[PDB]
């Protein structure tokens, strides 16, 4: 996606357009060939990989050209193929065995529908959705060897759909309903609740998935498929879609077969693991941050959410600054957080974790599942560099780390073998992420729909900064270490670093 977004930068800058999308065709937007010499030339200076007009012909779209610049394609297995637990799923199942997460790993998705949907038709749509995505009806029961996936049959996957009347503010009820625990060995990792009442106009459709079966990118497939299925089941027929290109097990199986054994030196896993053992060498145990309380001895996993609204001219300024320096918006937001901690006394070694989506294959681009590997983006701020300088360091660190994004985070932790503490997250405690909410989801289920935020009562790490476009900043802080007022000031201080950065990126940090 980093390669993907940076290619759009050159397409729009060379073709002088604003019609640059992930699925846009270079030649289709008026693209010739000297234009490719300029586009191919610029791509070399930023990404540093060998690109040529030859690549542009084969991959004339940013999405394709990005995948071309960088492993077998996901091959759909047999109809009777058994489920296969991906290394991503193993971590999520494992985390809930070692921690009292309080549902901190339940990802919520709430939509406001102008019409109180038909709970019976909705249920049929939820049953259809679960049947389409095997990941939504796959249980993880513990055994003597390890966790074993149990793919429920469509007839046997008891879906959980129910209506819920709102008494108080639905915002706090959504958080409460979302944080309810999941029993991955007996319950499917999908929960649907239709919140209705006299205080809410129409109803609020809440989809609560456990992260083991869905990530933030699965929101679009879920809503799109639940709309497609809901509309059909409302007409007495089964929803008419074309079969899924692949299932999660197919992606996991193809991914695991290619990853190889960490003991074989020629396998991608060990060869990537080796990069990280060097890249994360002599890593800080933890950053010297300003906390309001000492690190507890138990991970309460409880936290809050401090938001900082971003003016359109500031969102527009950040995008402009990114394009000028040949860096993604994430890299800008990441440098801001790094500077913030650096200015707060963290030091010159700012290890920030970040989620990278493994959705390169076209067979899993719009599929439901968890493809987010956590990566340690180690930013060095020594030598009192300017912001534009740190944008160079960040980009190099990111692109270099993005080429080794397939080593499971848990394996990197085992390879770097860091001093551990159940109250502290390994390698990193501050996470920076850039999310985008689904667009064109305003007329779902034949009504007036609109996404609703769920107030987070939990926190996965000490500090999680999130740049969320519809844009704003969301601070997921650990309640055991930070006070809400302190988080509000910290997210606001991030905004001020961004304001100064765009205005004068030549200023020391």
Instruction: Determine which residue in the list 19, 25, 28, 32 makes contact with ligand YJI, applying CB under 6 A.
Output: 32
Q: What would you report as the CA-atom Rg of the chain, rounded to the nearest whole angstrom? A: 23
Number of residues that bind ligand YJI (CB under 6 A): 3
The answer to whether residues 238 and 128 touch, using CB atoms and an 8 Å cutoff, is: yes
Beta-carbon neighbour count of residue 236 at 10 Å? 8
Contact set for ligand YJI, span 153-212 (CB under 6 A): none
Asked whether position 382 contacts ligand YJI by CB under 6 A, the answer is no
Contact set for ligand YJI, span 72-131 (CB under 6 A): none
Does the annotation list 423 as a binding residue?
no
Q: How far is the CB of 53 from ligand YJI (least distance, A)?
A: 6
Nearer Cβ to ligand YJI, position 32 or 343? 32
394-to-161, 434, 466 alpha-carbon distances in Å? 45, 15, 17
The answer to whether residues 387 and 501 touch, using CB atoms and an 8 Å cutoff, is: yes
Contacts of the segment 440-445: beta carbons below 8 A, 24+ positions apart: 441/111, 441/220, 441/223, 444/111, 444/113, 444/223, 444/226, 444/227, 445/113, 445/115, 445/117, 445/205, 445/227, 445/230, 445/231
432-to-214, 360, 456 alpha-carbon distances in Å? 20, 21, 17
Q: How far is the CB of 32 from ligand YJI (least distance, A)?
A: 4
Which has the closest alpha carbon to 333: 376, 291, 387? 387
Residue with tokens 């974790």: 353
Q: How far is the CB of 52 from ligand YJI (least distance, A)?
A: 10
Q: How far is the CB of 56 from ligand YJI (least distance, A)?
A: 9
Q: How far is the CB of 40 from ligand YJI (least distance, A)?
A: 11
Asked whether position 33 contacts ligand YJI by CB under 6 A, the answer is yes
Asked whether position 420 contacts ligand YJI by CB under 6 A, the answer is no
488-to-36, 62, 458, 492, 506 alpha-carbon distances in Å? 46, 37, 16, 6, 27
The answer to whether residues 129 and 154 touch, using CB atoms and an 8 Å cutoff, is: no
C-alpha–C-alpha distance, residues 67 and 357, integer Å: 13
- Give the contact letters, 40-79, x = binds to ligand YJI (CB under 6 A), - = no: -------------x--------------------------
Residue nearest to ligand YJI (CB): 33
Nearer Cβ to ligand YJI, position 38 or 302? 38
Nearer Cβ to ligand YJI, position 39 or 356? 39
Nearer Cβ to ligand YJI, position 33 or 75? 33
Nearer Cβ to ligand YJI, position 53 or 503? 53
Q: How far is the CB of 70 from ligand YJI (least distance, A)?
A: 24
Q: How far is the CB of 22 from ligand YJI (least distance, A)?
A: 24
Q: Which residues does the annotation place in the binding site for (R)-4'-phosphopantetheine? A: 33
Binding site for ligand YJI (CB under 6 A): 32-33, 53
């Amino acid at each position: 996606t980093a390669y993907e977004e940076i290619v759009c930068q050159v397409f729009a800058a060379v073709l002088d357009r604003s019609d640059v999308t992930a699925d846009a065709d270079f030649f289709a937007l008026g693209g010739h060939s000297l234009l490719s010499l300029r586009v191919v030339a610029r791509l070399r200076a930023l990404l540093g990989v060998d690109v040529g007009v030859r690549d542009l012909f084969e991959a004339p779209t940013p999405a394709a050209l990005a995948a071309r610049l960088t492993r077998p394609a996901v091959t759909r297995r047999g109809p009777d193929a058994p489920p296969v637990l991906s290394h991503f799923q193993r971590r999520l199942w494992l985390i809930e065995q070692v921690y009292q997460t309080r549902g901190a790993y339940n990802v919520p998705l709430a939509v406001h529908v102008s019409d109180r949907l038909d709970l019976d038709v909705l249920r049929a749509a939820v049953r259809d959705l679960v049947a389409r995505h095997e990941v939504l009806r796959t249980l993880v029961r513990s055994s003597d060897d390890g966790p074993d996936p149990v793919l429920l049959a469509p007839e046997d996957a008891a879906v959980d759909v129910a209506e819920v009347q709102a008494a108080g503010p639905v915002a706090d009820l959504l958080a409460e309903l979302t944080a309810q625990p999941f029993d991955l060995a007996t319950q499917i990792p999908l929960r649907v609740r239709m919140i209705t009442g006299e205080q809410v106009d129409g109803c609020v459709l809440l989809l609560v998935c456990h992260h083991i079966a869905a990530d933030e990118w699965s929101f679009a497939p879920l809503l799109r498929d639940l709309d497609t299925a809901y509309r059909a089941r409302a007409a007495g027929r089964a929803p008419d879609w074309e079969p899924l290109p692949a299932q999660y097990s197919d992606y996991a199986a193809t991914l695991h077969d290619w990853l190889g054994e960490a003991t074989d030196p020629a396998s991608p896993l060990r060869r990537q693991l080796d990069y990280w053992q060097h890249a994360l060498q002599d890593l800080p145990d933890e950053l010297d941050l300003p906390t309001d309380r000492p690190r507890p001895a138990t991970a309460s996993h409880r936290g809050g959410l401090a938001r900082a609204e971003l003016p359109p001219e500031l969102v527009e300024a950040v995008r402009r600054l990114a394009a000028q320096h040949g860096v993604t918006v994430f890299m800008v937001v990441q440098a801001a957080v790094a500077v913030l901690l650096h200015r707060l006394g963290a030091g010159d070694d700012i290890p920030l974790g970040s989620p990278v989506a493994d959705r390169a294959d076209e067979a899993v681009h719009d599929t439901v599942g968890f493809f987010l590997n956590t990566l340690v983006l180690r930013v060095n701020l020594s030598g009192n560099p300017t912001f534009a300088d740190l944008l160079d360091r960040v980009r190099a660190v990111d692109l270099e780390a993005f080429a080794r994004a397939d080593a499971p985070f848990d394996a990197v932790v085992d390879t770097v073998k860091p001093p551990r503490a159940v109250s502290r997250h390994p390698l990193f405690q501050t996470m920076v992420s850039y999310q985008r909410r689904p667009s064109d989801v305003d007329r779902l289920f034949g009504a007036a729909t609109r996404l609703v935020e769920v107030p987070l009562d939990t926190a996965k790490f000490d500090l999680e900064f999130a740049f969320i476009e519809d844009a704003h900043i969301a601070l997921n802080y650990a309640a055991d270490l930070f006070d809400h007022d302190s988080a509000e000031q910290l997210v606001a201080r991030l905004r001020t670093v961004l304001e100064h950065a765009c205005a004068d990126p030549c200023r020391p940090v």
